[PDB]
């Protein structure tokens, strides 16, 4: 599913992401924009054997199982496919664990390069 901007904003807010671990709603929507372009079915292969999954591009090296990432972990205890659902529940609940494991949202490369230190509030502007 490809989310609309404020549609995703509302979905993320309902799942309790606004100000979660200190990060305003705009940050999460901005991350979603540059990670996946609001697309829940986004996937990206990395050179280390891992893959990024879902609207927040959560990685299989630590967070989910795809059965083909050597030496990896599965800390969110889910198949990576769960992160591709039109229901963002699995991606949010996993994202909450990720952001709570120190380093904050710096785990998301796209957020770090395109969102951090910018007018992220513009991404929930007019919702
Ligand atoms: Na949803």
Author numbering: 1 to 127
Which text from the study accompanies this structure?
HEWL, a small enzyme (14.3 kDa) is one of the most common model systems to study interactions with compounds (e.g., drugs, metals, etc.).
The crystals diffracted to a resolution of 1.8 Å, and the structure was solved by a combination of molecular replacement (MR) and SAD, by exploiting the anomalous signals of the tungsten atoms. The HEWL–TEW complex crystallised in the P43212 space group as a “tetramer” (chains A–D), and is only the second HEWL PDB structure with this protein stoichiometry. Eight TEW molecules (TEW-1–8) were identified per asymmetric unit. PISA analysis (proteins, interfaces, structures and assemblies) revealed that there are no specific interactions that could lead to a stable quaternary assembly of HEWL in solution (hence “tetramer” is enclosed in quotation marks in this text; this is not a biological tetramer). “Tetramers” forming a pair are parallel to each other but differently orientated (displaced relative to each other by 90°) sharing one interface. This interface is the result of two monomers being crosslinked by four TEWs, with each monomer providing two POM clusters (TEW-1 and -2). Thus, POM did not alter the physiological conformation of the protein, thus further validating its use in protein crystallisation.
